């Protein structure tokens, strides 16, 4: 499996790079989030607990996955700002707030 960076945004106000991933799997099952943790910290080039994994869907039979990840400087900022699905998929926090 191979992770490549397609697209890079620089958001200054909050101090993060917003980043697009294409991840491959050829003859292999759908990418495994647990190895992708190990692989991520090097690709983004930021500490391991502030390099964040989000969004992947995986094509039907066409072996390419499209996806998004975050690289943050600020551990403080990230839990607060971000929409809850990310925080659980990375493993940070759950679901914020009920009724």
């Amino acid at each position: 499996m191979e992770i490549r960076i397609k697209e890079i945004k620089e958001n200054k106000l909050i101090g993060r790079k917003e980043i697009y991933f294409e991840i491959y799997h050829p003859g292999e099952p759908t990418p495994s989030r647990k190895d992708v943790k190990g692989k991520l910290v090097a690709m983004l080039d930021l500490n391991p607990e502030t390099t964040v994994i989000q969004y992947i869907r995986s094509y039907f039979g066409s072996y390419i996955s499209k996806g998004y990840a975050k690289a943050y400087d600020s551990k403080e900022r990230m839990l607060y700002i971000e929409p809850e699905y990310i925080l659980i998929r990375d493993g940070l926090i759950e679901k914020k707030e009920g009724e």
Binding site: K9, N11, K12, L13, I14, E18, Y80, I81, E82, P83
Partner: protein, 241 residues
């Protein structure tokens, strides 16, 4: 309906915001303010959609509150606000400046112009009328107003260019429209064009009043006096489809 609609629907959201109209079922309805709801561009659309700086309305509301936009020289904080046409929207945090302009298509586009022009806002005033102390006051369709004169005939009837200094809310450098002046066309079906007025002559009585113009290409157009908006001798640049 017996009350202001507080909810706008997505299928009621136009094609002029260039928005997906089957996305949910509820569209962002600004609270009453400068401008019309369907002829505005929402603050939600500008942060969230346009630039990718939000992926939820909570991101975009938090981002606006901390600060990433000032509109007309002053602070905003919620995403509900109808941004007008011929306004000045600012990213202080990126240094971008935009004009809110029509296309030939008639969708709102933010058209980039330099940091310099952010200072300027051209006004062509909506009506001119007396207030107490025998002073006349200036008006707009975004409600942007100034007071204090000595009355009298003054610069024009109502077809003005003012240079407006936006943090100060001051008027400066007044200028008439002529029969050799510039207009950009910002309502009607002839929108996006910028040219030189041939003559401002019209149909002298009743409700219709024509004004006519030629351009650089030199096409002949006719539009209402109300839909003639005087840029000046050019201050902002043209809008592109």
């Amino acid at each position: 309906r017996k009350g202001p609609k507080r909810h706008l629907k997505r299928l009621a959201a136009p094609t002029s915001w260039y928005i997906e109209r089957k996305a949910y079922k509820w569209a962002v309805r600004p609270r009453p303010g400068p401008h019309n709801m369907r002829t505005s561009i929402p603050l939600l659309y500008i942060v969230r959609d346009y630039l990718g700086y939000a992926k939820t309305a909570r991101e975009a509301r938090k981002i606006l509150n901390e600060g990433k936009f000032l509109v007309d020289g002053r602070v905003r904080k919620d995403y509900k606000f109808p941004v007008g046409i011929m306004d000045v929207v600012s990213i202080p945090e990126t240094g971008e400046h935009y004009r809110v302009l029509p296309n030939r298509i008639g969708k709102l586009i933010l058209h980039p112009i330099s940091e310099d022009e952010a200072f300027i806002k051209p006004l062509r005033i909506r009506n001119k009328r007396m207030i107490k102390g025998a002073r006349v006051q200036l008006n707009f369709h975004d409600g942007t107003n100034h007071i204090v004169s000595i009355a009298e005939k003054d610069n024009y009837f109502t077809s003005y260019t003012v240079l407006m200094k936006v943090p100060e809310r001051e008027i400066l450098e007044v200028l008439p429209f002529e029969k050799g002046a510039y207009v950009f066309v910002t309502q009607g079906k002839n929108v996006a064009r910028k040219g030189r007025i041939v003559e401002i002559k019209r149909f002298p009585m009743g409700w219709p009043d024509v004004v006519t113009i030629e351009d650089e290409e030199g096409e002949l157009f006719d539009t209402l006096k109300e839909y003639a908006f005087v840029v000046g001798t050019d201050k902002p640049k043209i809008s592109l489809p």
